[PDB]
Amino acid sequence: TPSYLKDDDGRSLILRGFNTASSAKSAPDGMPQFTEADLAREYADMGTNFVRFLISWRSVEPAPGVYDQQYLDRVEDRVGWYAERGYKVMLDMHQDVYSGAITPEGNSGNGAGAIGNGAPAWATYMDGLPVEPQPRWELYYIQPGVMRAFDNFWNTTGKHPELVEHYAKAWRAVADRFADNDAVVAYDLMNEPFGGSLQGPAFEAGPLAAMYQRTTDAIRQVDQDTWVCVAPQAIGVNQGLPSGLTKIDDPRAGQQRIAYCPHLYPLPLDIGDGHEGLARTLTDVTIDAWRANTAHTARVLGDVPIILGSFGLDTTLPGARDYIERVYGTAREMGAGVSYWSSDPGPWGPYLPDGTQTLLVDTLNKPYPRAVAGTPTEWSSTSDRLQLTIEPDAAITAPTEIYLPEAGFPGDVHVEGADVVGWDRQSRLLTVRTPADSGNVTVTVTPAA
Ligand code: NA
Ligand code: NA
Ligand code: NA
Ligand code: NA
């Protein structure tokens, strides 16, 4: 059965939010094009309680050994917006195709970029190997200069043992700033690791795991309590193949706080431009295969919690809502958190460029338990109902906290199996208390007559 991240009250967290935001990748100041008013809109429309907040190595460490505390001030400012609205934050050290420094035309400055993004220019060593224009961005991964930049980072070439050490110490700098931040729950060490010339389990169990171990150790010099979240290699594994990632040791006193944060991008959904016919058949197989592989690696890592850190699609495609609902149902059964890709404007996201909602908003805006006083064994919801079964824990005194959308709960609530402590119609938060002396408790929440 699944394991959960916990809040300071000991409640088990069911995490629902977005990646915010891809616009940070190219921004000179490292910040997403996302305001406090945008967060208020998100919360009002969907009741989210989590964010995978994109940060970047190029912003943390713009020159070797010279950390930018002003950038960290900016991150802290945004984290405060989230804190004020009761969100938990996972910071993602984000890259795609290594760096903006992989081409001159795509480099928005010092490794920032709209396509390639992440590492600072000083950490990018392509050794003069070419990077030719490609018709979709993912193809840059296999261009010679990008492959070489990764091979140098992982020190496959033997020429750059320092780069992983810089990466680990950049994470330590972030962790030193955020250790005492009560809204931060997780550090996602690297978006979509790619091995370059080294592929599969030899990469994952070799230099990838070694970087995760070094970085975990560095973070634990300054932060004992934040969950350290590790990803498999993305290529193949995103598409349903197994990971060879191996266990990371957590030097913290007591129980380990490592979590697993894989992504889900079925190939048939992409190539088929939607979720109908044989593409749907094969995407459903992918989801199920992915679930089994994800559960396996989460066991290997020490029976750890899971966060689906990224998944998404163009919501206008045939079958999109069915796909989204399938993924969220799977995450629910797995006890997984979810950060959807992404909050950015356009048909993948919740809002179009003019601020109009896509179908994503209504799809995501469902009741869910946010923080449960005990282990949630099973739950379900529809627009106007939620049911939740809880394995009791008498040590927890904080109430179970549940989001109820206005759409289905226009007035008061009726709760079977628990006492209502609070029903805040402004914040949309229901708080309930359940007995801890009668075994597993089932709570059913419906609109008042
Ligand atoms: Na900058
Ligand atoms: Na460079
Ligand atoms: Na924290
Ligand atoms: Na340990």
Q: State the amino acid at position 361 in one-letter form.
A: V
Q: Which ligand is nearest to the CA of 30?
A: 1
Sorted by sequence, the CB contacts under 8 Å of residue 71 that are 6+ apart come out as 29, 30, 59, 60
Distance CA 219, CA 169 (A): 8
Tell me if domain 1-14+365-449 and domain 15-364 are identical in fold: no
Q: State the amino acid at position 37 in one-letter form.
A: A
Q: Are residues 183 and 89 in contact, defined by beta-carbon separation less than 8 angstroms?
A: yes
Bridge-based pairing of strands 184-188 and 88-93 is: parallel
Q: Which ligand is nearest to the CA of 301?
A: 4
Distance CA 308, CA 162 (A): 31
Residues pairing with 185 in the sheet: none
Q: Is 387 helix (H, G, I), strand (E, B) or coil?
A: strand
Distance CA 165, CA 153 (A): 10
Sorted by sequence, the CB contacts under 8 Å of residue 38 that are 6+ apart come out as 343
* Residues, CB-to-ion distance under 5 Å, ligand 2: 121, 124
* Residues, CB-to-ion distance under 5 Å, ligand 3: 181, 184
Bridge-based pairing of strands 337-340 and 307-308 is: parallel
Distance CA 93, CA 118 (A): 8
Distance CA 338, CA 136 (A): 26
Distances in Å between the alpha carbon of 449 and those of 117, 139, 300, 414? Answer: 53, 56, 49, 8
CA of 166 to the centre of ligand 1 (A): 18
Distance CA 78, CA 343 (A): 15
Comparing C-alpha atoms, which of 192, 19, 234, 236 is closest to residue 96? 192
Instruction: Using CB atoms within 10 Å of the CB of residue 255, give its burial: 0 to 12 exposed, 13 to 18 middle, 19+ buried.
Output: exposed
Q: Which ligand is nearest to the CA of 183?
A: 3
CA of 20 to the centre of ligand 2 (A): 27
The CATH number, out of the four listed (3.10.129.10, 2.170.130.30, 3.20.20.80, 2.60.120.430), of the domain defined by the range 15-364:
3.20.20.80
CA of 30 to the centre of ligand 1 (A): 6
The full set of domain ranges for the chain reads 1-14+365-449, 15-364
CA of 67 to the centre of ligand 2 (A): 18
Q: Is 16 helix (H, G, I), strand (E, B) or coil?
A: strand
Distance CA 256, CA 3 (A): 12
The neighbour count for residue 226, using CB atoms within 10 Å, is: 23
Structure tokens at 307: 């966060």
Q: State the amino acid at position 420 in one-letter form.
A: V
Torsion of CA 344, 109, 162, 129, to 10 degrees: 100
Torsion of CA 139, 97, 32, 270, to 10 degrees: 30
CA of 5 to the centre of ligand 4 (A): 16
How many residues does this entry show for the chain? 449
The neighbour count for residue 291, using CB atoms within 10 Å, is: 18
Rg (CA), the chain: 21
Q: What is the resolution of the experimental data for this entry, in Å? A: 1.1
Q: State the amino acid at position 267 in one-letter form.
A: L
Ordered strands of the 12-13 beta sheet: 12-13, 368-372, 400-403, 429-433, 419-424
By what technique were these coordinates determined? X-ray
Distance of CA 209 to the CA centre of its chain: 19
Does domain 1-14+365-449 fall under CATH 2.60.40.1180? My reply is: yes
Distance CA 314, CA 292 (A): 26
Q: Which ligand is nearest to the CA of 153?
A: 2
